[model samples]
Every structure is written in C-alpha cells, then in structure tokens.
Target chain A: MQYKVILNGKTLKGETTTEAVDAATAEKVVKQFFNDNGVDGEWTYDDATKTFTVTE
Target chain B: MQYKVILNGKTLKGETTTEAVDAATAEKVVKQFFNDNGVDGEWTYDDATKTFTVTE
Candidate 1:
C-alpha cells in the first residue's frame, strides 16, 4: 500500500508517500527521505489518509 | 516486511512485531500496539532488525 508524507515545520511543506508491509519500516523510510531532502522534525500520522505529518 | 517491537520502557519488557507498508504507519501501529498492551514512551527505530524500541 502507498503511504503519504506531509512535511511542515521546515522549508518543505507538502504531501507525499511513505510504507511498511508492517508502519515502522514505513515511517523509517519517511524520515530517511526527509533527512535526505534536508528536512527534519516530529512525524505524526493520519489514519484517515494514512499520512505522516512532520512538525519541526 | 516483519518489524520488531521491543518494550524496554515498561515493566513488561519484551520484543514483538509491528509495521506499515510506510515506516510512519509502522511506527504508528507499533505505538498503538504498545498502548493497547499498556506501554508508552519514546520509540526509536532499528534499521538492522527493523525494530522499534520503546523507551518510556
């Protein structure tokens, strides 16, 4: 399944995909992705859209 | 993928599996699992075993 990543509390603010075939691995990949893009903060999830919203 | 949930921050210390098809959801589910099991704290991820160790 596709997961959404929302970046905020940084210069980057948008929605995107992030996953696990389980959510731990999925969230890890999301943070790793954000780190690669020079963004970092707290990541919270939305069970509705299955989104991880980051707040720095 | 199978993810491991390690509970160290709680009296009932143990390890188990939790996940997302995104790491965010994986972490979310991991926390939810812990909450249901009467555990809570900071969740740190392990890339090696894909484990989320909860440090309460």
Candidate 2:
C-alpha cells in the first residue's frame, strides 16, 4: 500500500510523499509521520489515494 | 476514562497529566496530544489506566 501525508490546520509544510507500507502498519506509520512533522490535529486515512489528511 | 502520555524514544518530556475522554475518541485525542508534544514513535492505549505510551 502507498501512504501520503497532508496538513490542513494552519498551513501545509512537509512533503506529501508517498511510501509503500503494509496494510496493518499503515495507521501506525502515518501517526508517527504526522507526529514527526508536528501535526497537532485530527486525521483520517483514505483508501483510494492512500492519503493521510490532518484536519484541525 | 483518563489519559496520560509517556515518551520512550529519547527521554521523557511533558506532563503525565491525565485527561478525561471517551473510548471512541481516546485514540484520536492521544494521537493529537503526542503530535502536539512532538512524540516520534509508536504508541498503545490502555483501557485499564488510560495510559498512552510512546515506544520507539
């Protein structure tokens, strides 16, 4: 599976770079990615685009 | 239920402060709290004590 990160609270600041990961570990990987980039908001994962959107 | 944050990648920082939250939103709340405090690791939630431990 592919995973990408996006921000929507204040302004987006990191790459929406996609990564290949397993289905089971996708959520954990995305959570760590968001934390590493300092996203203090809510997020949901998209199965279609494999996008992780952080919505505040 | 109560929630507490514990860091385990580097040294521990931030309060072990407990917050009241529901089971449905517990994970989201803890994830946001960890992201807000810059916790770059994996975490698991405990229903017994309502603890969120960030383990790398």
**Retained true contacts (fraction), each candidate:** 0.00, 0.10
For model 2, state the Cα shift of residue B9 in Å: 16
Give interface RMSD, every candidate, in order. Answer: 16.7, 14.6
Q: Each candidate's TM vs. the true structure?
A: 0.30, 0.26
Worst ten-residue run, lDDT, model 1 chain B?
B6-15
lDDT of each: 0.38, 0.37
- Please give me the DockQ of candidate 2 compared with the native complex: 0.08
Tell me the deviation in Å of residue A54 in model 1: 17
Clashing pairs in 2: none
Lowest summed-lDDT stretch of 10 residues in model 1 chain A? Answer: A6-15
Candidate 2 residue lDDT tens string, A13-39: 222322334433544554554455354
- After superposition of all CA atoms, the RMSD between model 1 and the true structure is 15.7
List runs of model 2 lying over 4 Å from the truth.
A13-15, A18-20, A36-56, B1-56
Per-residue error (Å), model 1, residue B13? 36
